[PDB]
Amino acid sequence: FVARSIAADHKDLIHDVSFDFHGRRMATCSSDQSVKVWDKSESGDWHCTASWKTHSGSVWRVTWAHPEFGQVLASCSFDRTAAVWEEIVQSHWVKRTTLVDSRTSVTDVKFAPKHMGLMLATCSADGIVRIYEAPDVMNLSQWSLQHEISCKLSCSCISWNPSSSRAHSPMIAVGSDDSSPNAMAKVQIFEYNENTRKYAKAETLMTVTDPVHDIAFAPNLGRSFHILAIATKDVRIFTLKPVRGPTKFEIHIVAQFDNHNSQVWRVSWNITGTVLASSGDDGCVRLWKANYMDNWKCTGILK
C-alpha cells in the first residue's frame, strides 16, 4: 500500500470524506463552513472542481445520493438545518431546499436505500430523529416530514440497513453519545412496522455503556442475517438473526478488538462487506476480516 497526499487548501479540520456511487468522485467538508468536490483524472490525479460556501456553522457529515436521482448531495452543520444541494449544467451547484426543524444542531444525515424511494434522515443533538421523503422525484424541493422519534438521549450517529430483500423491513440504528455516569444503553434499533405504518422499538444493546462515536451496517449482498459495527473506545461487531409488533432478534457479539489503545472515531465497511476499517486516536487505519470460522483477525495496518 502507498499514500498520495492531497493539498486540502482548507482553513480548519476536515470532518468527512464521502465517495461517489461509481467511485470516481469524492466530497469533503470542514468546520470552515464549506464543501469541496474532487474528481479523479486520466492520470489518477485529484483536483478541485467546486469550492462554494454552504452553511454558517461548522459543516459536519456530508453524503452522496444515488445518481438515479441525479448528482444530489446533502449536509448538516452547526446551523440547525440540512440541505439537499444539487449540481446543474461550466456547471455549478445550486441549493434546492433547507430543512429547518430542530432546535439543536443536527449531527448526522444519511440517505436511505434506493428500494424505498428518495428519503433522508437527520438526528438532532436533543434526541429527535426524523425521516423525510420527496414523492415528486424530478423537483428536489417538495420535501415532506413523515415520522418523528424520540431517543431520550443525545444522538450522535445514524446508519441505514441496505438489505434489499422484501423479507427484511427497513430499520435504522441510532448512536448515542451521552457520557453521564448513569450506565444505560447507547445503541438502539428502530424497525418499520408496515402493519401500523410507524417505527417501533425492536432491540436495545444493553452491553454498550461507553460513548458511541460512529455506527455502520454491513452491506448484505445475499447474507441471511444482519451485521453491525460500533465505534466505541473499542471496536465491536454484532450479529442479528431474525426468528421466523416488531420482529424478535438474537444479539450476539463477535469481535472485541482492543489493539488501538485509544478511542475509535470512525468505522467503514467495504462493498462486498467482508472487510472492515476503523481509525482511532492512535492515528492509523486497521482492516479486519473473517477467518472463515466466525473468527476475525487483523489483516493490515495503514498509517
Binding site: 441525479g70 449544467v89 424530478m138 423537483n139
Partner: protein, 73 residues
Amino acid sequence: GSPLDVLKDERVQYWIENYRNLLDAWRFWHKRAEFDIHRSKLDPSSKPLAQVFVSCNFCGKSISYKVTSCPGC
C-alpha cells in the same frame, strides 16, 4: 448573392434539386451535406427536411426546444 426574387423562381430551384439528386446518384453523401450547408446559409427560402420528433405520453406535446424532466408539464 441573389436577392430574394430570383431564388423564388420555379426554374432556379429545379436545377438545385436536380443537382442534389445527381449527387445522390454519385453516393457522394458528405459533399451533398456540405452543399446543403452552403445553400441553407445563402438561401432563406429553402426549408430543411421534414423528419420525426418524439412526443410525451402525459403532456402530449413535443420536447424539442430539470433536464430529465419534460418542459411541458
